[model samples]
Target: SMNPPPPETSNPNKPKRQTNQLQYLLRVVLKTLWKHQFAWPFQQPVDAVKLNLPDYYKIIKTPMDMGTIKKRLENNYYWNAQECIQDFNTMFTNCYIYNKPGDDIVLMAEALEKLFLQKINELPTEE
Candidate 1:
C-alpha cells in the first residue's frame, strides 16, 4: 500500500522577521577583523553606529609606531587596517564575494572612517 502524504501547514497571519542589513554587514566586518586580530572591542550585534577601540593593542608579530598606526587606521577604514598597510584591501576583497549593485559599501566605509577618526582623536598624545 502507498503511504499517505503529509498535510500542508498554513499560518498566513504570522509576521515575518525584519532583517537589519547594516547590522549584518557590521557583524561580518567585526568578525573578520577579530579573526585577523585587528582588535574589535565591541560585542555581538555590532553597533557600527558607535565604534570604540580596544583597551590595548592585540596585534602580535607586526610592530608599529603611533604615527604608522594612526595612518593605517585612518586610511584603512579602521577594521580594514588588519595587519599591514593594505588600505581597505582586505575588507574590499572579503566583501566583494557578497557584492550587490545596491550594497551599502560606501555608507559603511564612511561610518567606519568617522568612528575610527573619532576614536583616534580620543587617544592621549605625548606632551
Candidate 2:
C-alpha cells in the first residue's frame, strides 16, 4: 500500500531558494548596454570581429548575439557555471568600466561588485 503525503507546515527555518543576484544584475547591465549601443567589449561574434577581438567570442563561450544573451540570462539554469560567472565579473570590472561614462553604468557596476563580493564570502578557504 502507498503511504500518504507528509503534512506541510510553515517552517521559519526552512531554507530559501538560492538567489542569483549577480546573474540578474548582469542581464540588466547587458540589456541596458545593448539598448544604448554602448561600446561594451563583449559583443556578437560578427561585431567582435569588427572590434578586432574575435578571441573574445571563444573566451565568452556563449552566443554573443544580444537576443541569445537575453534568453540565456532569463533561463537561470546556468547560474551555477562558475567559469561564466568569473569571466563576466572580470569582463565587467576590467572592460565595462572603461569608455563608459554614465551614472547608470556606475550604479550597475557597484551593484554587480556588491553581489560578487558577497559570493566571495561563500567560497571555500584555500589551503
Candidate 3:
C-alpha cells in the first residue's frame, strides 16, 4: 500500500527530462510565437534591394529574422536562454531601425516582444 504507483510523466529516481528541459521549454515558447499571424513577416529576412533602403541600408544590419533564429536552434547555436532571448531583442531592434516607426511590421515586432517577455516571465526561475 505504501508503494502505491509511479507518476506517468515523471520519475523520482531518474532526472530524465532535466537533460534538455530548457530546450523543451524554449521550443514550446517558440511554437506559440510562430503560431501568431503577425509572425509571418518575421519568418523571413528583409530584402534590402527590393525594399529600397539604400540611404539607411548601412544603419540597418543583421537581418536577424525568425527564420534564422529557428535555423540557429536547429544548428545548436543557442545553449543559454538569455542568448536566445537576446537574439529576439536584436531582431525586434533591427525591425525598429529599418522600418518606419509607424509601420505595421514595426508594431508587430513590439507586440510580439511583449508576448515573448510575458511568456518568459511566466516560466520558472526568472528572478
Candidate 4:
C-alpha cells in the first residue's frame, strides 16, 4: 500500500513531470539547504544528474539535530530534531556557503537551529 505509482519513463510526446520520489525528496532537501545558506554538492552544474530543487531544499531545510544528523538514518527516522537542527546550522555557517569570518557563525547557527526546531517540530509528521 505504501508503494507509489510507477514512474512513466517511456512517454515521448507528453511533458516529463518529475516522478521519482527520491529525486523529488532530494530536490526538496537541497533547496531547503540553499534557503538556509548552505552550499549543496548538487548546486554545481554537472552533466550526469539534473538537479531537483524541491528535494535539494527539503534535505537542506529539514533540520536534523546533532543526535539525528550524526546518527545513521534507519527506517526513515531521525533522532533529536533539535540537535539535528543545531548541527545543520553549525555546519552551514562553519562550512557551507555562508561561512564568513567574524560573522558570529556560532551564535547564528545556534539561533537558527533553535528557531527551525521549534517550527519544524510543530508540523505534523508526513507519510
The per-residue C-alpha lDDT of model 3 at residue 9 equals 23
- TM-score-based ranking: 3, 2, 4, 1
Taking all chains together, each candidate's TM-score versus the true structure is 0.23, 0.32, 0.71, 0.26
The predicted structure with the larger lDDT, 1 or 2, is: 2
Off by over 4 Å in 3: 1-25
Candidate 2 clashing pairs?
A: none
lDDT of 1 by residue, 22-92 (tens): 23223443334434322332112222234342311232112222233333333332322223224233333
Task: Encode model 2's per-residue lDDT on 4-102: one tens digit a residue.
Answer: 222122334543232455454355545445554343323432344455654544444323233334444554434344533554565455434342556
Which residue ranges in model 1 land beyond 4 Å of their true spot?
1-103
**Residue 83 lDDT, candidate 4, scale 0-100:** 29
lDDT of 2 at 46: 32
Q: Best by TM-score, which number?
A: 3
lDDT of 4 by residue, 63-126 (tens): 2232333222222232233323444554544324433444564445554445455555444343
lDDT of all predictions, in order shown?
0.32, 0.44, 0.64, 0.36
Rank ordering of all candidates by lDDT, starting from the highest: 3, 2, 4, 1
Better of 1 and 4 by lDDT: 4
Q: Give a tens-digit lDDT track for model 3, residues 1-120.
A: 112121122234533322252464457657777788799987766655566655444675444667766755555565566666777788889888777888998888888888887777
Error of model 3, residue 33, in angstroms = 1.6
